[PDB]
Amino acid sequence: LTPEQIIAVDGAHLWHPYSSIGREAVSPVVAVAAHGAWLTLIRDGQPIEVLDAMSSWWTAIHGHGHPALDQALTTQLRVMNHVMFGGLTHEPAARLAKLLVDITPAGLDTVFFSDSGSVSVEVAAKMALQYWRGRGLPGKRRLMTWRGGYHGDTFLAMSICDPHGGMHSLWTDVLAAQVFAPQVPRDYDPAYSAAFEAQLAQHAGELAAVVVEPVVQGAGGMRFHDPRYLHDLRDICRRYEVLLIFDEIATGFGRTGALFAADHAGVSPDIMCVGKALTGGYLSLAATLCTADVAHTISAGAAGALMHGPTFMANPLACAVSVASVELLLGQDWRTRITELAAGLTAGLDTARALPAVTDVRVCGAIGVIECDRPVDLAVATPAALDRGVWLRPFRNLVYAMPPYICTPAEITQITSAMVEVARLVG
Amino acid sequence: LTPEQIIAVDGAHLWHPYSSIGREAVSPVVAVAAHGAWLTLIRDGQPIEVLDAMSSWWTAIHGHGHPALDQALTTQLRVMNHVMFGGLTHEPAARLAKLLVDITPAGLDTVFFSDSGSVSVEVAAKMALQYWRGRGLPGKRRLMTWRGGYHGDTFLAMSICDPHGGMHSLWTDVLAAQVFAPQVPRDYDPAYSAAFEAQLAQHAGELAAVVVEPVVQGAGGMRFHDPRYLHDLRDICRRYEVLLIFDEIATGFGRTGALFAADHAGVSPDIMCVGKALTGGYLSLAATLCTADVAHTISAGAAGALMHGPTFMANPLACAVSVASVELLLGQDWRTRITELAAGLTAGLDTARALPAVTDVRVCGAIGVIECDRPVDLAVATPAALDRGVWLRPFRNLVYAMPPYICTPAEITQITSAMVEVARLVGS
Ligand SMILES: Cc1ncc(COP(=O)(O)O)c(C/N=N/c2nc3ccccc3s2)c1O
Ligand SMILES: Cc1ncc(COP(=O)(O)O)c(C/N=N/c2nc3ccccc3s2)c1O
């Protein structure tokens, strides 16, 4: 297929994410290659190199086509593509489980693999519900969260998306009714935590768990909060016997400047979800971790088992590339790498603060955000970014980047420049 | 890691499907390699080769490590591992979409990719509900199915599982309450369809869709039903204005002796789920296809867009290997291959019919089932199967195989002999 033929087939047959069929304002751009931090895209019938400023939706932390990951994949392919995980186990699953237990917050001792982020969220909810069922308290079946959150697109995940402003707002009438605290503020305010506790207390007997994105709320608005809130959440959940679940599908593997965002507060949740950067952006994989207590209570309950098990659970290929990606990250001074990226993002975005359409500029580890005073038009932003050698995808009123960790200083500069000029055009 | 170290790590840290932690019992067996129709497993420290009689749960239709599929994957790896599908498109996704639209039942014109069977089912439900909202009928929000079914493990997918039940009871009081018709029988009885219609009719104004596995019910009991029932469902759904969803995640890609099980009935659903054998069993990928009417009705509704988009949607690696898997299937006389497999399963499993513990023996395309009168003890069945060089995994009272399409007559003879032996051991 030529780029023209791809565009034709795509228009006729392919549904894109969060899109209509036949009435999308912008057509998709054909991608033809990816290497390191760079994508080869077709523009006006000509190939162009652009920086993957978004790391392919926060996955490609080591960039594309990294020799260590390519080889981990080809080596596993030579041995064993896949086998079912029912009654069988294998080396990639064992190596990965051991890595994930060792590097996640203390006490997360068990790993349930699944195929995607939304599934790992559903598994976390199932763990929480079965846990209380195992304690003979089946009335603890609701979830609590704060506003501004997002946890995926399957029906239980949607139930904890922000109900009046989140992407699943039109569905609230068919979703499980969960408990929502107000939007968590950026600055630490003890009064916020007190109000959260007072609200949780009213519902404790019907709550299985608090589920939140720690430190960084992504799809809900790339908002940052003070890590001390997580300390309060841990304290509150412990004192009211509510399980705490951290969804680290976006925040994991160094992105926020700590290995996991929970680490900014030194907090351990009872249950944790991971995905995205887990595989280095090669293949779909996610995991849900839980404590020995949670696992044993589920296992010693009336069910005797966790009632979940996906087809390609613990796929050897996906596990193998994930092992290599985690080892690649752990084997370098990743913390200094992220500190350097953050400094680059900070310095490069500083000049946006004075732009007339810009209401905030904020950086957290390798995440850079320009918040604008109006929704950003993709028909303007997309060409403008491409004209500057950068793939950027704004959403809502936000121009943002989460670059591969391999980006050089010059590359970060180029990314921040494109973002600044996008914000300038908005205004 | 050595196989002993794998076991140690596994026992401490790994959750297995529908299992416990620390309460096994019976450790899992270490798999160290897979090639063609064979797995290499560690039994008492010894590596042994055994037949993958279940195709690693329906997936490995061309066997493991097929040269054409390995090559397709490595070719794509060198060019582009993965890009975001938000505002970007690529050759593997386009190539695969065109193939799937061409080989599926008439009228399924648009493809939404996801990463697993359960997700594709959630996407199909969302399409159905959003369709009716786009017609100003938001009360059409429930699903209807028949008993014996399985559609995955996410909370919406659980709500249409057989309650009585694949894994209900514990949950029923937290799941969406769907409408269930009685177990669809093996043999065609027009009275069953009339009763299904009457039940549906009273719920029509609150129903978005009927969702069923066509011809073969997998995890819910490895049961088969006359394809004519699907013709009736198509008709009932048409007349009462309820969408029809076929979940072909297990039945797809030739398994039942037709390219898709719907083809046995010569009927097209409004929405269709595919997965598993899609990728030749290399990687997780699934797809939900719908008609032009479904897609446009969603897209013209005030809601507008379908708010769904998995991170790895339309992953180039997974799409690349799938293209190669589908082309490899289509470029051979697959129909004769399945007919021969059905023949070998029938001939091999014949012995079982006369066994004391055996209540049914049944074959449909490349699927063979021995049903027993009591649960099959794994402690007995496993060594018996392994002694015979075959990996089998009975569940409930069922001994079954869904072998790779590449299996030779000798291999089918080996597989069925292991099954007959397991059944023989049940009733003694
Ligand atoms: C915290 C959290 N939990 C669960 C999920 C769901 O993962 P999947 O969409 O099933 O792969 C996600 C997926 N989020 N993906 C995102 N993509 C973008 C893109 C632009 C801006 C924000 C986001 S969040 C998540 O962030
Ligand atoms: C019809 C149907 N729909 C959805 C799913 C869910 O797929 P995922 O497990 O989420 O990838 C499935 C998954 N089925 N897995 C099965 N494994 C076995 C194993 C032995 C016998 C039957 C089955 S069905 C399915 O069969």
PDB file of C-alpha atoms in Angstrom, chain A residues 72-258:
ATOM      1  CA  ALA A  72      14.823  -9.153  23.606  1.00  0.00           C
ATOM      2  CA  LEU A  73      11.821  -9.560  21.294  1.00  0.00           C
ATOM      3  CA  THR A  74      13.606 -11.444  18.490  1.00  0.00           C
ATOM      4  CA  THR A  75      15.339 -13.772  21.022  1.00  0.00           C
ATOM      5  CA  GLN A  76      12.049 -14.701  22.668  1.00  0.00           C
ATOM      6  CA  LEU A  77      10.408 -15.139  19.234  1.00  0.00           C
ATOM      7  CA  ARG A  78      13.046 -17.753  18.404  1.00  0.00           C
ATOM      8  CA  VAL A  79      12.156 -19.785  21.531  1.00  0.00           C
ATOM      9  CA  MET A  80       8.437 -19.471  22.316  1.00  0.00           C
ATOM     10  CA  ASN A  81       5.950 -16.921  20.977  1.00  0.00           C
ATOM     11  CA  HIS A  82       3.111 -17.707  23.387  1.00  0.00           C
ATOM     12  CA  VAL A  83       1.679 -20.487  25.511  1.00  0.00           C
ATOM     13  CA  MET A  84      -1.517 -20.443  27.624  1.00  0.00           C
ATOM     14  CA  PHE A  85      -1.022 -19.414  31.306  1.00  0.00           C
ATOM     15  CA  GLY A  86      -3.504 -22.025  32.607  1.00  0.00           C
ATOM     16  CA  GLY A  87      -1.479 -24.738  34.325  1.00  0.00           C
ATOM     17  CA  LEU A  88       1.748 -23.521  32.700  1.00  0.00           C
ATOM     18  CA  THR A  89       4.306 -20.873  33.588  1.00  0.00           C
ATOM     19  CA  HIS A  90       7.426 -19.536  31.893  1.00  0.00           C
ATOM     20  CA  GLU A  91      10.639 -17.580  32.270  1.00  0.00           C
ATOM     21  CA  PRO A  92       9.479 -14.194  30.829  1.00  0.00           C
ATOM     22  CA  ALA A  93       6.511 -14.096  33.271  1.00  0.00           C
ATOM     23  CA  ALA A  94       8.733 -15.090  36.228  1.00  0.00           C
ATOM     24  CA  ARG A  95      11.509 -12.617  35.381  1.00  0.00           C
ATOM     25  CA  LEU A  96       8.987  -9.801  34.907  1.00  0.00           C
ATOM     26  CA  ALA A  97       6.995 -10.583  38.073  1.00  0.00           C
ATOM     27  CA  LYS A  98      10.206 -10.606  40.128  1.00  0.00           C
ATOM     28  CA  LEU A  99      11.295  -7.268  38.629  1.00  0.00           C
ATOM     29  CA  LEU A 100       7.892  -5.642  39.246  1.00  0.00           C
ATOM     30  CA  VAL A 101       7.626  -6.873  42.831  1.00  0.00           C
ATOM     31  CA  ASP A 102      11.170  -5.622  43.543  1.00  0.00           C
ATOM     32  CA  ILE A 103      10.748  -2.080  42.170  1.00  0.00           C
ATOM     33  CA  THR A 104       7.152  -1.176  43.096  1.00  0.00           C
ATOM     34  CA  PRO A 105       6.244   0.295  46.498  1.00  0.00           C
ATOM     35  CA  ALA A 106       6.991  -2.022  49.406  1.00  0.00           C
ATOM     36  CA  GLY A 107       4.559  -4.897  50.019  1.00  0.00           C
ATOM     37  CA  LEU A 108       3.157  -5.348  46.515  1.00  0.00           C
ATOM     38  CA  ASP A 109       4.078  -9.037  46.357  1.00  0.00           C
ATOM     39  CA  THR A 110       1.725 -10.535  43.753  1.00  0.00           C
ATOM     40  CA  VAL A 111       1.301  -9.788  40.038  1.00  0.00           C
ATOM     41  CA  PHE A 112      -1.703 -10.426  37.778  1.00  0.00           C
ATOM     42  CA  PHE A 113      -0.873  -9.815  34.075  1.00  0.00           C
ATOM     43  CA  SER A 114      -3.497  -8.622  31.584  1.00  0.00           C
ATOM     44  CA  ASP A 115      -3.515  -7.144  28.083  1.00  0.00           C
ATOM     45  CA  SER A 116      -4.355  -3.463  28.627  1.00  0.00           C
ATOM     46  CA  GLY A 117      -4.638  -0.585  31.088  1.00  0.00           C
ATOM     47  CA  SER A 118      -8.467  -0.623  31.280  1.00  0.00           C
ATOM     48  CA  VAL A 119      -8.423  -4.354  31.984  1.00  0.00           C
ATOM     49  CA  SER A 120      -5.843  -3.966  34.748  1.00  0.00           C
ATOM     50  CA  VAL A 121      -8.191  -1.378  36.350  1.00  0.00           C
ATOM     51  CA  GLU A 122     -11.096  -3.834  36.187  1.00  0.00           C
ATOM     52  CA  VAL A 123      -8.834  -6.500  37.781  1.00  0.00           C
ATOM     53  CA  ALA A 124      -7.903  -4.026  40.576  1.00  0.00           C
ATOM     54  CA  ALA A 125     -11.648  -3.417  41.240  1.00  0.00           C
ATOM     55  CA  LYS A 126     -12.318  -7.176  41.208  1.00  0.00           C
ATOM     56  CA  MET A 127      -9.477  -7.768  43.689  1.00  0.00           C
ATOM     57  CA  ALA A 128     -10.926  -5.097  45.973  1.00  0.00           C
ATOM     58  CA  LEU A 129     -14.488  -6.467  45.759  1.00  0.00           C
ATOM     59  CA  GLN A 130     -13.401 -10.095  46.253  1.00  0.00           C
ATOM     60  CA  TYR A 131     -11.216  -9.083  49.159  1.00  0.00           C
ATOM     61  CA  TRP A 132     -14.187  -7.748  51.166  1.00  0.00           C
ATOM     62  CA  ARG A 133     -16.367 -10.644  50.033  1.00  0.00           C
ATOM     63  CA  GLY A 134     -13.592 -12.862  51.435  1.00  0.00           C
ATOM     64  CA  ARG A 135     -13.849 -10.981  54.786  1.00  0.00           C
ATOM     65  CA  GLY A 136     -17.640 -11.537  54.765  1.00  0.00           C
ATOM     66  CA  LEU A 137     -18.342  -7.863  54.093  1.00  0.00           C
ATOM     67  CA  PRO A 138     -19.995  -7.869  50.615  1.00  0.00           C
ATOM     68  CA  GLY A 139     -21.574  -4.445  51.261  1.00  0.00           C
ATOM     69  CA  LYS A 140     -18.163  -2.869  50.699  1.00  0.00           C
ATOM     70  CA  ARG A 141     -18.604  -2.709  46.940  1.00  0.00           C
ATOM     71  CA  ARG A 142     -18.501   0.969  45.980  1.00  0.00           C
ATOM     72  CA  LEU A 143     -15.424   2.894  44.877  1.00  0.00           C
ATOM     73  CA  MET A 144     -14.379   6.395  45.894  1.00  0.00           C
ATOM     74  CA  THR A 145     -12.222   8.808  43.973  1.00  0.00           C
ATOM     75  CA  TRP A 146     -11.643  12.520  43.505  1.00  0.00           C
ATOM     76  CA  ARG A 147     -12.794  14.516  40.518  1.00  0.00           C
ATOM     77  CA  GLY A 148     -10.540  15.155  37.496  1.00  0.00           C
ATOM     78  CA  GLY A 149      -9.689  11.457  37.121  1.00  0.00           C
ATOM     79  CA  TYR A 150      -9.506   8.991  34.233  1.00  0.00           C
ATOM     80  CA  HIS A 151      -8.993   5.209  34.356  1.00  0.00           C
ATOM     81  CA  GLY A 152      -9.889   3.901  30.885  1.00  0.00           C
ATOM     82  CA  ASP A 153     -12.845   3.091  28.712  1.00  0.00           C
ATOM     83  CA  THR A 154     -14.319  -0.240  29.837  1.00  0.00           C
ATOM     84  CA  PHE A 155     -17.601   0.134  31.760  1.00  0.00           C
ATOM     85  CA  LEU A 156     -16.301  -0.190  35.330  1.00  0.00           C
ATOM     86  CA  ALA A 157     -13.282   2.030  34.561  1.00  0.00           C
ATOM     87  CA  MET A 158     -15.660   4.642  33.115  1.00  0.00           C
ATOM     88  CA  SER A 159     -17.564   4.729  36.420  1.00  0.00           C
ATOM     89  CA  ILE A 160     -14.617   6.465  38.113  1.00  0.00           C
ATOM     90  CA  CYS A 161     -13.945   8.949  35.293  1.00  0.00           C
ATOM     91  CA  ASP A 162     -14.888  12.555  36.225  1.00  0.00           C
ATOM     92  CA  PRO A 163     -18.750  12.586  35.855  1.00  0.00           C
ATOM     93  CA  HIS A 164     -19.316  16.219  34.812  1.00  0.00           C
ATOM     94  CA  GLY A 165     -16.418  17.132  32.599  1.00  0.00           C
ATOM     95  CA  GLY A 166     -14.736  13.766  31.994  1.00  0.00           C
ATOM     96  CA  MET A 167     -14.926  12.080  28.596  1.00  0.00           C
ATOM     97  CA  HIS A 168     -17.581   9.556  29.727  1.00  0.00           C
ATOM     98  CA  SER A 169     -19.979  12.216  31.099  1.00  0.00           C
ATOM     99  CA  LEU A 170     -22.903  11.257  28.804  1.00  0.00           C
ATOM    100  CA  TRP A 171     -22.893   7.680  30.148  1.00  0.00           C
ATOM    101  CA  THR A 172     -23.373   8.352  33.825  1.00  0.00           C
ATOM    102  CA  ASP A 173     -26.984   7.079  33.709  1.00  0.00           C
ATOM    103  CA  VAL A 174     -25.836   3.490  32.853  1.00  0.00           C
ATOM    104  CA  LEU A 175     -22.670   3.386  35.001  1.00  0.00           C
ATOM    105  CA  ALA A 176     -22.146   2.179  38.568  1.00  0.00           C
ATOM    106  CA  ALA A 177     -22.673   5.137  40.912  1.00  0.00           C
ATOM    107  CA  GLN A 178     -19.380   5.821  42.697  1.00  0.00           C
ATOM    108  CA  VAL A 179     -18.387   8.329  45.369  1.00  0.00           C
ATOM    109  CA  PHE A 180     -16.632  11.529  44.198  1.00  0.00           C
ATOM    110  CA  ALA A 181     -14.688  13.998  46.316  1.00  0.00           C
ATOM    111  CA  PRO A 182     -13.969  17.482  44.864  1.00  0.00           C
ATOM    112  CA  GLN A 183     -11.077  18.122  42.487  1.00  0.00           C
ATOM    113  CA  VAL A 184      -7.782  17.684  44.355  1.00  0.00           C
ATOM    114  CA  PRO A 185      -5.944  21.059  44.468  1.00  0.00           C
ATOM    115  CA  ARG A 186      -2.389  21.585  43.203  1.00  0.00           C
ATOM    116  CA  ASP A 187      -1.146  23.087  46.510  1.00  0.00           C
ATOM    117  CA  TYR A 188      -1.375  21.142  49.768  1.00  0.00           C
ATOM    118  CA  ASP A 189      -4.359  22.235  51.868  1.00  0.00           C
ATOM    119  CA  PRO A 190      -5.029  20.239  55.067  1.00  0.00           C
ATOM    120  CA  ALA A 191      -8.704  21.272  54.800  1.00  0.00           C
ATOM    121  CA  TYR A 192      -9.037  19.300  51.554  1.00  0.00           C
ATOM    122  CA  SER A 193      -7.836  16.113  53.292  1.00  0.00           C
ATOM    123  CA  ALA A 194     -10.176  16.680  56.264  1.00  0.00           C
ATOM    124  CA  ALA A 195     -13.139  17.056  53.886  1.00  0.00           C
ATOM    125  CA  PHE A 196     -12.125  13.897  51.992  1.00  0.00           C
ATOM    126  CA  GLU A 197     -11.988  11.996  55.317  1.00  0.00           C
ATOM    127  CA  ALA A 198     -15.356  13.354  56.458  1.00  0.00           C
ATOM    128  CA  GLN A 199     -16.909  12.202  53.140  1.00  0.00           C
ATOM    129  CA  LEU A 200     -15.206   8.790  53.156  1.00  0.00           C
ATOM    130  CA  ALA A 201     -16.318   8.266  56.785  1.00  0.00           C
ATOM    131  CA  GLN A 202     -19.992   8.664  55.761  1.00  0.00           C
ATOM    132  CA  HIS A 203     -19.534   5.868  53.204  1.00  0.00           C
ATOM    133  CA  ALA A 204     -16.925   3.583  54.810  1.00  0.00           C
ATOM    134  CA  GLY A 205     -19.263   0.584  55.272  1.00  0.00           C
ATOM    135  CA  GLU A 206     -20.135   0.600  51.563  1.00  0.00           C
ATOM    136  CA  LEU A 207     -16.639   1.329  50.167  1.00  0.00           C
ATOM    137  CA  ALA A 208     -14.295  -1.346  48.836  1.00  0.00           C
ATOM    138  CA  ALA A 209     -11.551   1.068  47.854  1.00  0.00           C
ATOM    139  CA  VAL A 210     -10.310   4.562  47.071  1.00  0.00           C
ATOM    140  CA  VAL A 211      -8.867   4.594  43.531  1.00  0.00           C
ATOM    141  CA  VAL A 212      -6.798   7.571  42.308  1.00  0.00           C
ATOM    142  CA  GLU A 213      -4.006   8.567  39.897  1.00  0.00           C
ATOM    143  CA  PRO A 214      -1.080   9.519  42.210  1.00  0.00           C
ATOM    144  CA  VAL A 215       0.492  13.003  41.734  1.00  0.00           C
ATOM    145  CA  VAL A 216      -0.475  13.385  38.021  1.00  0.00           C
ATOM    146  CA  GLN A 217      -3.985  13.208  36.608  1.00  0.00           C
ATOM    147  CA  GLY A 218      -3.569  12.739  32.857  1.00  0.00           C
ATOM    148  CA  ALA A 219      -6.601  12.618  30.557  1.00  0.00           C
ATOM    149  CA  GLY A 220      -8.604  14.600  33.101  1.00  0.00           C
ATOM    150  CA  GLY A 221      -6.429  17.676  32.564  1.00  0.00           C
ATOM    151  CA  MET A 222      -2.662  16.986  33.050  1.00  0.00           C
ATOM    152  CA  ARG A 223      -3.084  18.367  36.582  1.00  0.00           C
ATOM    153  CA  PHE A 224      -0.460  17.920  39.308  1.00  0.00           C
ATOM    154  CA  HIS A 225      -1.092  17.635  43.058  1.00  0.00           C
ATOM    155  CA  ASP A 226       1.106  17.731  46.130  1.00  0.00           C
ATOM    156  CA  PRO A 227       2.350  14.211  47.036  1.00  0.00           C
ATOM    157  CA  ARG A 228       1.390  14.836  50.694  1.00  0.00           C
ATOM    158  CA  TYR A 229      -2.239  14.187  49.671  1.00  0.00           C
ATOM    159  CA  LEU A 230      -1.245  10.550  49.055  1.00  0.00           C
ATOM    160  CA  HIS A 231       0.107  10.306  52.592  1.00  0.00           C
ATOM    161  CA  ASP A 232      -3.277  11.536  53.839  1.00  0.00           C
ATOM    162  CA  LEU A 233      -5.095   9.050  51.577  1.00  0.00           C
ATOM    163  CA  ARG A 234      -2.947   6.206  52.984  1.00  0.00           C
ATOM    164  CA  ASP A 235      -3.643   7.349  56.563  1.00  0.00           C
ATOM    165  CA  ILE A 236      -7.419   7.746  55.896  1.00  0.00           C
ATOM    166  CA  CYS A 237      -7.771   4.380  54.154  1.00  0.00           C
ATOM    167  CA  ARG A 238      -5.840   2.597  56.912  1.00  0.00           C
ATOM    168  CA  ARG A 239      -7.953   4.177  59.671  1.00  0.00           C
ATOM    169  CA  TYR A 240     -11.312   3.471  57.990  1.00  0.00           C
ATOM    170  CA  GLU A 241     -10.439   0.036  56.562  1.00  0.00           C
ATOM    171  CA  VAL A 242     -10.858   1.037  52.945  1.00  0.00           C
ATOM    172  CA  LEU A 243      -8.380  -0.414  50.417  1.00  0.00           C
ATOM    173  CA  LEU A 244      -6.199   2.066  48.509  1.00  0.00           C
ATOM    174  CA  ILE A 245      -5.604   1.561  44.787  1.00  0.00           C
ATOM    175  CA  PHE A 246      -3.095   3.650  42.803  1.00  0.00           C
ATOM    176  CA  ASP A 247      -3.487   3.683  39.077  1.00  0.00           C
ATOM    177  CA  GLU A 248       0.040   4.207  37.740  1.00  0.00           C
ATOM    178  CA  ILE A 249      -0.653   3.299  34.150  1.00  0.00           C
ATOM    179  CA  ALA A 250       0.425   6.836  33.010  1.00  0.00           C
ATOM    180  CA  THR A 251       2.769   7.740  35.909  1.00  0.00           C
ATOM    181  CA  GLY A 252       4.942   4.606  36.164  1.00  0.00           C
ATOM    182  CA  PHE A 253       8.537   3.824  35.192  1.00  0.00           C
ATOM    183  CA  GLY A 254      10.213   7.141  35.974  1.00  0.00           C
ATOM    184  CA  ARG A 255       7.908   9.498  34.147  1.00  0.00           C
ATOM    185  CA  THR A 256       7.217  11.887  37.085  1.00  0.00           C
ATOM    186  CA  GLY A 257      10.825  11.912  38.308  1.00  0.00           C
ATOM    187  CA  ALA A 258      10.324   9.022  40.754  1.00  0.00           C
TER     188      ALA A 258
END
